[PDB]
Design a protein around this nucleic acid. Structure first.
Lengths: 46, 275
RNA sequence: UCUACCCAUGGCCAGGGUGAAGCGCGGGUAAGACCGCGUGGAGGCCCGAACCCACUUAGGUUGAAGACUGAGGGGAUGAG
RNA sequence: CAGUCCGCCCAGGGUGAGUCGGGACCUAAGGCGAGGCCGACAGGCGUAGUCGAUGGACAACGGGUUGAUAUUCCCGUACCCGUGUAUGUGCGUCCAUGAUGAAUCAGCGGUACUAACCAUCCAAAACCACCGUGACCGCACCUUUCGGGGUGUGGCGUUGGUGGGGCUGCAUGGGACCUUCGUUGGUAGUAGUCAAGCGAUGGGGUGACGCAGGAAGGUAGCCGUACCGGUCAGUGGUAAUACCGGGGUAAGCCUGUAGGGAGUCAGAUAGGUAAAUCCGUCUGGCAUAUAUCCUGAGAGGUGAUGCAUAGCCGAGUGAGGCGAAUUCGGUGAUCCUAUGCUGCCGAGAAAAGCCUCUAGCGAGGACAUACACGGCCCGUACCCCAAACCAACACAGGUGGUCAGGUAGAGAAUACUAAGGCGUACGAGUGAACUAUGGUUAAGGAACUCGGCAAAAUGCCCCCGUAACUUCGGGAGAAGGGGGACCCACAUGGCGUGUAAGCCUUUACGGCCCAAGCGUGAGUGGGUGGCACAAACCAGUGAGAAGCGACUGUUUACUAAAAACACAGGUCCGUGCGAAGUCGCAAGACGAUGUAUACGGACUGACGCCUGCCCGGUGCUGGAAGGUUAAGAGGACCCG
RNA sequence: AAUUCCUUGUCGGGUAAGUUCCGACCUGCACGAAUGGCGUAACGACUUCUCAACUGUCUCAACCAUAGACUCGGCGAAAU
């Protein structure tokens, strides 16, 4: 009976992997942030 | 120097273990150890480059002095002989007469309380390390150097010993453990006598647990893989590849040394592979 | 953040058995070889809960559940 | 479902820290990375550094309080860092006093050089003898019936390789002359240095580490008891002999018990990048120390005239007041001594912190007592095997760690219970068929079926008794047989513990002994009851013969757990060392802080007896005479 | 024979009756030595046969109790 689902919340890992200090680190991440800012989103990054 | 276990379990049917009959302590010298952490065979990218390695007992590295050039004319006394994990030959501890302490690999026949010298003016006895230029011809050697001043590289396993065939000009001819006749500059240093613990090759490792302890994951043959995994895989029923055995990367089974490299002008005859 | 493998640092394994090496005594041997008696507490050892699995069967099959439940079942000091 | 209720809706309230978990303290695996190297650009690695707990170091325990917080607030008693003032003792410089210096004046043989001298190793040019034929010539062959190749008969290029003398020259190691300290004989042990105190980012020690196994000494806990406060529960008997409730209290501060560990003093010295009185090494004196020193569970004293409790009064919202006895034993941890002790091989993190050394700063500074003060930033409510988290739901699934009462019992299993918590969110009726889950069955007992699928059955403790075969360990709980209840006696017995106790005394937290008291199995003999003594729950079916795989293990999450994968053991091939192999265009990295008794690849798969023939085909390895054949060089001739 | 189309090969065990099973023969369609040949104590939720005990698996079904099914009140779907 191993009913272990796929989402195990851990906000430290959330912020560490999808965080702002990480999106602004590589070229692609800066592009993603600018793209979201252009589309108008309210949550630029996790 | 081996103990054979009794058949009290299928994992110990014919297993054997080294007798440790030469050790004199069970702990290192606290000032000559360094940390070690195993990788599993994964290089700076994180990818496996060498397979079948990892998940083994922790161990610590005991600093060893292979570049024996400083203490020249200063005697030393062997204080103990010990067991180190990451090496096939036993380690031996030396108290110098100045007050330094340091390790070496133990030659066969060494024993506690024995005194060893060094340098060009040294006696021809096991443990004494002196330049290849001051060693007569026909004497067994171990732990010799390749370039002058560049540490000891050749023949430092357990029980192996090169032989010094003779000298010709500014070079000395050496018969390696494998059978090659190489030529090495005569400024290179070397220790006398063969390496100790020469029975350790006669050990059955019993069960698979012992190999997993020393650390090596299991290896899966080629024929049982699929055609996309290995140039052998495939075939309903039991096959044989039908491909002139090849490596997992397609490289055939031939000769792999790079042709015509700088060091081929010092090699007199390579090893013999027939029979 | 599920799953495969590896790296650093922590945790867990009720209860009951069998009796290896060595050591002491004896017998025995020119001497070894070995045999009875004490001490000793090894092993991918044995029976068995927590824990990890998933061999059989019935139920479910617009389910309680997008792979589960009841009975039995394998491992349980180790490649855990 | 309904709902006056709600984890729903609305308003207001609520989270109190020098000691708890984090930061201001430290590093591991990993991340970023000043310069930097590599790469057409984009970018890849990485040094010094700086981050990163799942680890290291670090000061607080009982009781009370509100409707919501408590190691946070209040009460009682403590501990850790800093600051100011006052006091007593007080060691220092300024000076003044002790120890101590250091070089000239003629003065070593070694560091060890020039030239040389000795020993050893090595090979230049010519000169001596031999295989071997790249050639090649004739000659003998199985020949092609000799007309061809290739092998021995002997001469040529010694083309390659051997051996002894010879050798012009290198080089290493010693002695030899180049200043380093000479034996100090005056000049110069006062005059330069050291004697308060703080002392490093520098040296050294410690921090500092594995798995397994008991025996011993304790405590928490639980069960009885002296003693104290109370009940008559409408029954046949029971007033005290019966029954129920109490039979408590921490950190810290004293003392140093069981256990565990350890030698001390003198000389001199580049080894610790400079110096060391510190650490190592060598040479000596001292007993191998009940001694002496370090660590240390517990008992005991104090904290405690306090705090808290069984009960009695009040009042019944539940405020408020009083408050007894508190000794002795038995059993006993999976917790403490214990980062201990003993074994074994698979050999078991770093840094800060603390101690000590000098280098250095120095005219002020060290110790103790009294009084007055500062102790920063984040979390603190509420759920937390769950209707509050991951599952679309108030979902029979999933979720790491700490406590662990009583009876039976080997047990944290199983049955019933104590503290504590709940009856969980649609009901009420009713002997229909049929389906699911439990229960029983006459006579027969696999006759059912693809198949004993499902069910039934054996099931524990103590004594007896145990086969073929074997790698001598096993097979084995083999198979098979007997007993199990409650009373009485042997029994004031036997065993454990140990009080008043006698003994000795190392006057100590000594140890031997042992009435009483408390606790406990096993055996024997005689009785008693039932259909049944393992009485309920818990709790192996066993034996014979084939095939496959040696064995424990791994595998298709979700129709395949196997004869498939792995394995310990073999043989082959490659690899002489920033090796072979791999990731990358390159730098670089793993292989390995390894070195052929090692590393990578391929096939077979414990152990025993063995692996027979073929190199023609395809590969891999080693080569030469010839033919073949690309770029580049070559530029006769011809043409415009 | 995990390998045999002919095939239910031939003989013998075992049952009252044996296309499965065991021991032998060998005419090997189309075994064979590290894509290893033949054996082997111990081990196996592996595949195949036989025995003892046991039983509703069966001759052959019967009865009891719970959860649905059926009736009354409330809320109130679905594929087609």
């Amino acid at each position: 009976a191993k009913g272990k689902r796929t989402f195990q919340p851990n906000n430290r890992r959330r912020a560490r992997v999808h965080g702002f200090r990480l999106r602004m680190r590589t070229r692609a991440g800066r592009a993603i942030v600018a793209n979201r800012r252009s589309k108008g989103r309210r949550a630029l990054t996790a | 120097g081996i103990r054979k276990y009794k058949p009290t379990t299928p994992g110990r049917r014919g297993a054997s273990v080294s007798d440790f009959a030469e050790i004199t302590r069970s702990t290192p010298e606290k000032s000559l150890v360094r940390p070690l952490h195993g990788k599993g065979g994964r290089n700076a990218h994180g990818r496996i480059t060498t397979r079948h390695k990892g998940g083994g007992h922790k161990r610590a590295y005991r600093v060893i002095d292979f570049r024996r050039h400083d203490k020249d004319g200063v005697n030393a006394k062997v204080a103990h002989i010990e067991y180190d994990p990451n090496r096939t030959a036993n380690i031996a501890l030396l108290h110098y007469l100045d007050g330094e302490k340091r390790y070496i690999i133990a030659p066969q026949g060494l024993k506690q309380g024995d005194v060893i010298e060094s340098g060009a003016n040294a006696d021809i006895k096991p443990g004494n390390n002196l330049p290849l230029r001051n060693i007569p011809a026909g004497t067994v050697i171990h732990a010799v150097e390749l370039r002058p001043g560049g540490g000891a590289k050749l023949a430092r396993s357990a029980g192996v010993s090169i032989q010094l065939l003779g000298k010709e000009g500014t070079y000395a001819a050496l018969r390696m453990p494998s059978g090659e006749i190489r030529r090495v500059d005569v400024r290179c240093r070397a220790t006398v006598g063969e390496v100790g613990n020469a029975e350790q090759s006669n050990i059955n490792w019993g069960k698979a647990g012992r190999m997993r302890w020393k650390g090596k994951r299991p290896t899966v043959r080629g024929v049982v893989m699929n055609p996309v995994d290995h140039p052998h895989g495939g075939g309903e029923g039991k096959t044989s590849g039908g491909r002139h055995p090849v490596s997992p990367w397609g490289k055939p089974e031939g000769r792999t040394r790079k042709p015509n490299k700088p060091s081929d002008k010092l090699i007199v005859r390579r090893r013999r592979t027939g029979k």
